[PDB]
Amino acid sequence: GEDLLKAEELAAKYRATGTAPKKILGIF
């Protein structure tokens, strides 16, 4: 499943932000 890869990606990205919903915070 590539949604698991996406889950890795989001884990690579969002955790890079520090907190997933703060994906908008990075934009703030």
Swiss-Prot record:
It comes from Solanum tuberosum. Binds to both simple and complex galacturonides. May be involved in cell-to-cell signaling and molecular transport. The lineage of its organism: Eukaryota, Viridiplantae, Streptophyta, Embryophyta, Tracheophyta. It is found in: Cell membrane. This is Remorin. The chain holds residues 171 to 198 of 198 of the full protein. Transmembrane segments: none annotated. Belongs to the remorin family. The N-terminus is blocked.
